[PDB]
Amino acid sequence: MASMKKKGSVVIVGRINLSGDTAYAQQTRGEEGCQETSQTGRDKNQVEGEVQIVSTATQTFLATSINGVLWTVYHGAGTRTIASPKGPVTQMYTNVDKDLVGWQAPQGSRSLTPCTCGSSDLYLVTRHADVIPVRRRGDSRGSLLSPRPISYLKGSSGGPLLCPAGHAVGIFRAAVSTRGVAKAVDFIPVESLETTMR
Ligand SMILES: COc1ccc2nc(C)c(O[C@@H]3C[C@H]4C(=O)N[C@]5(C(=O)NS(=O)(=O)C6(C)CC6)C[C@H]5/C=C\CCCCC[C@H](NC(=O)OC(C)(C)C)C(=O)N4C3)nc2c1
Ligand SMILES: [Zn+2]
């Protein structure tokens, strides 16, 4: 009992910059400071933007602010706290059945607006700041206009699917692949986030 360890916090280690004409990834914390911040849960770095790059000791993925909540996937974050300036912050939403978790959005983040356009021409933002056109094919599925090996999507769970107007349509959850090629994506619809919020 006395030797039982505690899992560290999720740590924001960068962001996908979508503020201008060019999307690009930025790193805000190196691996060493990440490990220390994960243990203490104390992250004094200023947060900016809608899409964060997050890490644990063993995984890296994305997290997306929508409606004042920073959302990501349960298969990345588990039940972990997230680091913040004043210490670990406990999840506000947890739903393993949807592969979904959420924390209060960090001070300084900006939130995406939930999409009400009803459009099926979507855009997936990856951890490498690729903007991938995706045609919506169902409530939780969309096809890549240009399929790519799954290597190019690995690490992007928790990222957004956006409509042409830049609203949040869903959270990237899983890749649909045949012989290692991602032809489609599975995502958590924003309406499912809004229901979780109730
Ligand atoms: C632990 O409790 C739970 C609860 C609910 C749950 N629901 C789930 C649906 C679920 O799927 C598992 C995790 C998820 C996943 O890899 N996503 C990411 C990702 O980037 N991840 S990540 O950032 O690298 C990471 C690993 C966090 C750091 C987006 C894709 C990028 C490349 C695909 C790699 C090849 C795996 C292809 C799987 N295709 C797949 O299952 O397709 C369907 C059509 C769904 C069968 C897949 O995509 N997979 C399996 N796991 C869970 C686990
Ligand atoms: Zn929209």
Report DSSP state, residue 49: B
Contact 73, 97 (CB under 8 A): no
Based on the residue annotation, tell me whether 143 is a catalytic residue of this protein: no
Best mutation site among 51, 53, 55, 73 for ligand 1 pocket (most ligand atoms within 8 Å of CB): 73
Q: Please give the Cα distance from 169 to 104 (Å, whole number).
A: 19
Q: Please give the Cα distance from 98 to 193 (Å, whole number).
A: 9
Q: Please give the Cα distance from 68 to 104 (Å, whole number).
A: 6
Q: What are the backbone angles phi and psi of residue 98, rounded to the nearest 5°? A: -100, 0
Q: What is the DSSP string of 70-116?
A: EEE-HHHHTT--B-BTTS-B--SEEETTTTEEEEEPPTTB-PBPBP-
Based on the residue annotation, tell me whether 155 is a catalytic residue of this protein: yes
Give the residue whose CA is nearest to atom 31 of ligand 1.
154
Q: Nearest-CA neighbor of 76 among 49, 98, 58?
A: 58
Based on the residue annotation, tell me whether 128 is a catalytic residue of this protein: no
State the structure-solving technique: X-ray
Give the residue whose CA is nearest to atom 26 of ligand 1.
76
Tokens of 111: 């939130």
Give the residue whose CA is nearest to atom 37 of ligand 1.
175
Percentages (nearest 5) of helix, strand, coil residues in the chain:
10, 45, 45
The amino acid present at 65, given as its one-letter code, is S
Around ligand 1, the residues with Cβ closer than 6 Å are 59, 61, 74-76, 96, 99, 150, 153-157, 172-176, 186
Cα of 122 vs centre of ligand 2, distance in Å, is 9
Compute the C-alpha angle 27/55/112, nearest 5°.
70
Q: Please give the Cα distance from 87 to 81 (Å, whole number).
A: 9
Q: Which helix (H) or strand (E) segment is 180 a member of?
A: none
Q: Which helix (H) or strand (E) segment is 151 a member of?
A: none
List domains and CATH numbers for the chain: 1-112 (2.40.10.120), 113-198 (2.40.10.10)
- CA distance readout (Å), 16 to 23, 78, 88, 103, 148: 7, 22, 23, 19, 20
Contact 69, 80 (CB under 8 A): no
